[PDB]
């Protein structure tokens, strides 16, 4: 989901990746 | 006495946390931990929560001296 705190595309819609799901 | 509804309170041993627990009276042998947890004048039994566990770079003195520059 887009509006979730952490999904696949929830980092895309909100701008940056996570501290458990990094860039690579 | 009144033998009847009143149970016999069958013996069961508690797991001896802070010294010997008061002995086998009830059939409930389990605690979480630490029967006394301190000697009970409450000798600061802290686990360092949201308060001053992290004391570096805050609750400290930064940005120069003791601020003589005021006036």
């Amino acid at each position: 989901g887009k509006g979730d705190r952490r999904t696949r595309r929830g980092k895309i819609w909100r701008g940056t990746y996570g501290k458990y799901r990094p860039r690579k | 006495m009144k033998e009847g509804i009143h149970p016999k309170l069958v013996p069961a041993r508690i797991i001896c946390g802070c010294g010997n627990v008061i002995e086998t009276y009830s059939t409930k042998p389990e605690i979480y931990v630490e029967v006394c947890s301190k000697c009970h004048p409450f000798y600061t039994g802290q686990q360092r929560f949201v308060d001053t566990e992290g004391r570096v770079e805050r609750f400290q003195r930064r940005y120069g001296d003791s601020y003589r520059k005021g006036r």
Partner: protein, 87 residues
Amino acid sequence: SLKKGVFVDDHLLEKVLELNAKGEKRLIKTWSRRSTIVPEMVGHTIAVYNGKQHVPVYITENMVGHKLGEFAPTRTYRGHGKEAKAT
């Protein structure tokens, strides 16, 4: 989301801390809250524009890393109602 640089405004950084030189009356007039309240002096009363007017704040030793940004009364909300809807 606070960082290693605890910023106070250069207009208001050390011009609140005139108490620590000698010791004076328990009021001094700062302006901002986006700047951090000064951690050098404790226990006294700091005058501030608290959102509505220049009314002071008084700490009671409960702040370790808590933000002063929750101190802003200017929305004197009396209660609900008084709407006159459908317009």
